[PDB]
Design an enzyme around this catalytic site. Structure first.
Site, mmCIF file in Angstrom:
data_model
loop_
_atom_site.group_PDB
_atom_site.id
_atom_site.type_symbol
_atom_site.label_atom_id
_atom_site.label_comp_id
_atom_site.label_asym_id
_atom_site.label_seq_id
_atom_site.Cartn_x
_atom_site.Cartn_y
_atom_site.Cartn_z
ATOM 1 N N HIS B 36 0.812 -1.197 0.000
ATOM 2 C CA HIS B 36 0.000 0.000 0.000
ATOM 3 C C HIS B 36 0.862 1.269 0.000
ATOM 4 O O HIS B 36 0.339 2.361 -0.220
ATOM 5 C CB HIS B 36 -1.001 0.016 1.146
ATOM 6 C CG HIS B 36 -0.431 0.279 2.503
ATOM 7 N ND1 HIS B 36 -0.156 -0.688 3.453
ATOM 8 C CD2 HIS B 36 -0.114 1.469 3.064
ATOM 9 C CE1 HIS B 36 0.296 -0.091 4.541
ATOM 10 N NE2 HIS B 36 0.339 1.242 4.323
ATOM 11 N N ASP B 63 -0.634 -7.417 0.884
ATOM 12 C CA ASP B 63 -0.086 -6.091 1.129
ATOM 13 C C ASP B 63 1.451 -6.198 1.117
ATOM 14 O O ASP B 63 2.104 -6.276 2.146
ATOM 15 C CB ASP B 63 -0.576 -5.474 2.447
ATOM 16 C CG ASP B 63 -0.218 -3.998 2.565
ATOM 17 O OD1 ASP B 63 0.411 -3.465 1.622
ATOM 18 O OD2 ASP B 63 -0.580 -3.385 3.597
ATOM 19 N N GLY B 141 2.873 5.460 9.678
ATOM 20 C CA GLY B 141 4.227 5.621 9.162
ATOM 21 C C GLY B 141 5.090 4.383 9.351
ATOM 22 O O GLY B 141 6.109 4.228 8.670
ATOM 23 N N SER B 143 4.222 1.449 8.482
ATOM 24 C CA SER B 143 3.918 0.513 7.404
ATOM 25 C C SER B 143 5.155 0.173 6.619
ATOM 26 O O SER B 143 5.989 1.017 6.293
ATOM 27 C CB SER B 143 2.910 1.104 6.428
ATOM 28 O OG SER B 143 1.650 1.237 7.034
ATOM 29 N N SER B 159 1.639 -4.048 7.968
ATOM 30 C CA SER B 159 0.536 -3.668 7.087
ATOM 31 C C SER B 159 -0.362 -2.596 7.726
ATOM 32 O O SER B 159 -0.559 -1.532 7.136
ATOM 33 C CB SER B 159 -0.261 -4.904 6.667
ATOM 34 O OG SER B 159 -1.396 -4.544 5.881
#
EC number: 3.4.21.12
Lengths: 4, 198
Positions: B36, B63, B141, B143, B159
């Site tokens: 993402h 993801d 942030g 991720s 994720s």
């Protein structure tokens, strides 16, 4: 739920 | 730049995410991260400088992504833990109940345990299935950032999960946290990638  | 799990990078001068793990694809240098975080061909920057581009991604459904880096980048078998490092050794997948930590540019290095597998996240873009859940906290942030055991077994990449109004789930007890990661093994095999280890 959320991405991140 | 030196490529270390957990550090910040930007995407098209806009979003921020965290590096997952240094990898190779043959002679090509890369890092894995969350899908993402960027679309194919999006430009990644670290320290103000272009480091590479998104080579491939799947999101939603999965993801996952990897960023294909210029040869000038320095791949390292490491994940940030404050100003220390965790050495990346392999990708043996830990069982429910194991201790695990995660690293990312917003909440830093956070630890907890693995609480469930095969969890679906119903994100606005669509479901993402197959995620592993831990109770280490996280926030906006983080991720893409590393999930790793203390013994250096890389588990997956951040994720998402149950972000509270403050942007993280660090302010609620562990028992209430859903912090979800994409398993590393399917990313490595999907894209033919090998971890950089030390």
């Amino acid at each position: 739920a959320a991405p991140v | 730049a030196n490529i270390v799990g957990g550090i910040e990078y930007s995407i098209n001068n806009a979003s921020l995410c965290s590096v997952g793990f240094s990898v190779t694809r043959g002679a090509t240098k890369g890092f894995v991260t969350a899908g993402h975080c960027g679309t194919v061909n999006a430009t990644a920057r670290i320290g103000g400088a272009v480091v590479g581009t998104f080579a491939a991604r799947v999101f939603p459904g999965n993801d996952r992504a990897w960023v294909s880096l210029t040869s000038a980048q320095t791949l390292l078998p490491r994940v940030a833990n404050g100003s220390s490092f965790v050495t990346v050794r392999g990708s043996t997948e830990a069982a429910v109940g194991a201790a695990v930590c995660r690293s990312g540019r917003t909440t830093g290095y956070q630890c907890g345990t693995i609480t469930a597998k095969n969890v679906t996240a119903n994100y606005a873009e669509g479901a993402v299935r197959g995620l592993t859940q831990g109770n280490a906290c996280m926030g906006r942030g983080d991720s893409g950032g590393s999930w790793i055991t203390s013994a250096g077994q890389a588990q997956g990449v951040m994720s998402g999960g149950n972000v509270q109004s403050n942007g993280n789930n660090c302010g609620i007890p562990a028992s209430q946290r859903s912090s979800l990661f994409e398993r590393l093994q399917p990313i490595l095999s999907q894209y033919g990638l090998s971890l950089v280890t030390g």
